[PDB]
Antibody, heavy 220, light 214 residues
């Protein structure tokens, strides 16, 4: 039962560094070298470097020169990832180990640790109702309403329609950065049912303990 | 640095069918190559070690071949849970490098996007903000081009796009495109258009509205 337990996600400021953790278990920690891999949405997976707990120290990837100076510690079988500068280092970092003795392929991986670099502070989201121009209800047999959530930090926010009773025809999209995470959701129902049968989006933001239930109404 | 190239970011397949992902190492990495699979929000899973060896527990449907500069991952008969990302990785000489990955997706009937455009809400305008939102939902193939036009001229500054992966139920894709201006600039223009170019129609799908005009 080989297992690698990584650390919870952290939100460092665009300036300092953060030491990540990886608790190996189920095998003699010193018998295998630990590896670290980075994964960003646009650049894919990139190997960072390895470490020998038996002590052969390290060997880093050219690209992660001094921005990543690994370290470890026996008597606890945990490996650490320093992360120096940090600013464009926002991504998920993995802890990896190989399986057999003669293949550098990574058979064992940690669950990964998300790292977000931002100077923003906890901020409640503004929620904006999206209704078809001039109220009405479209021009077909179906009408689409929406909810725009922006200016919040940090992730995440939960969004439902009519307290969850409206789940079909819903499209809720991944939030995108921009100082204050912004996301949106659309709901599509039968034209004759709105505004006859009310529709409200419920947005909740754990970090700020805030909730907003914005009803969607015809507008001019 | 050796460069692993996976020429296909996405590959259309079907359940019960055969599919082959290809990988091309910039150099002869001999047989030092591995294949990984990854599902959203999870870590990579080793599927193949040393070019063509199944790791333990990896089902017979998964196969890999090649040795030299060209390698190929194959799935005899695709199953629902195989519609994920597969990564190539050479471990011949450091630094270890991974391919860009290939996402397998379910092929289905072409479907035109339903496009909806929304003017800024009064509540946002009072805060000095003006976001125009455009939804493009339930379309297939994923290939789509969204353009914004303000008073006719195309606008690229201030556009933020978001999309969902292929739906696990209806195999379509959806997308949101938001044009965010300040109320100051928003009120200095009159015509706002969201234009979707998709293979399902010769003419791009267009949705618009005029400030203050119903």
């Amino acid at each position: 039962a080989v297992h690698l337990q990584g650390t919870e996600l952290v939100k460092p400021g665009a300036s300092a560094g953060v030491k990540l953790s990886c608790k190996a278990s189920g095998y003699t920690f010193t018998n295998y070298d630990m590896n670290w891999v980075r994964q960003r949405p646009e650049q894919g997976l990139e190997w960072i470097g390895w470490i020998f707990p038996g002590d052969g120290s390290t060997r880093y990837n050219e690209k992660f020169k001094g921005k990543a100076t690994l370290t470890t510690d026996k008597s606890s079988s945990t490996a650490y990832q320093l992360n120096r500068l940090t600013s464009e280092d926002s991504a998920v970092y993995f802890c990896a180990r190989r399986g057999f003795h003669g293949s550098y392929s990574f058979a064992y991986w940690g669950q990964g640790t998300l790292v977000t670099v931002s100077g923003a502070k906890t901020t409640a989201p503004s929620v904006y109702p999206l209704a078809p121009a001039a109220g009405a209800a479209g021009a077909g047999s179906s009408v689409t309403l929406g909810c725009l959530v922006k200016g919040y930090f940090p992730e995440p926010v939960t969004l439902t329609w009519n307290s969850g009773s409206l789940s079909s025809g819903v499209h809720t999209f991944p939030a995108v950065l921009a100082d204050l995470y912004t996301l949106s959701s659309s709901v599509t129902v039968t034209s004759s049912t709105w505004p006859a049968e009310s529709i409200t989006c419920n947005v909740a933001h754990p970090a700020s303990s805030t909730k907003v239930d914005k009803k969607i109404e015809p507008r001019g | 640095d050796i460069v692993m190239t996976q020429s296909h970011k996405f590959m259309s397949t079907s359940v019960g069918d055969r599919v082959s992902i290809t990988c091309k190492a910039s150099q002869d990495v001999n047989t030092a190559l591995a294949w990984y699979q990854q599902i959203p929000g999870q870590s990579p899973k080793l599927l193949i070690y040393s070019a063509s060896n199944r790791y333990t527990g990896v089902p017979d449907r998964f196969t890999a071949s090649g040795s030299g500069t060209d390698f190929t991952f194959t799935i005899s008969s695709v199953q629902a849970e195989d519609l994920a990302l597969y990564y190539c990785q050479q471990h011949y000489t450091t630094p270890w490098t991974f391919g860009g990955g290939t996402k397998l997706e379910i092929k289905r009937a072409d479907a035109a996007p339903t496009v909806s455009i929304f003017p800024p809400s009064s509540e946002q305008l009072t805060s000095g903000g003006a976001s125009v939102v455009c939804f493009l939902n339930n379309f297939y193939p994923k290939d789509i081009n969204v353009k914004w036009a303000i008073d006719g001229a195309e606008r690229a500054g201030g556009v933020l796009n978001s999309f969902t992966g292929q739906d696990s139920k209806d195999s379509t894709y959806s997308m949101s495109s938001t044009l965010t201006l300040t109320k100051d600039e928003y009120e200095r223009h009159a015509s706002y258009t969201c234009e979707a170019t998709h293979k399902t129609s010769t003419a791009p799908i267009v949705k618009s509205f005029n400030r203050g005009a119903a």
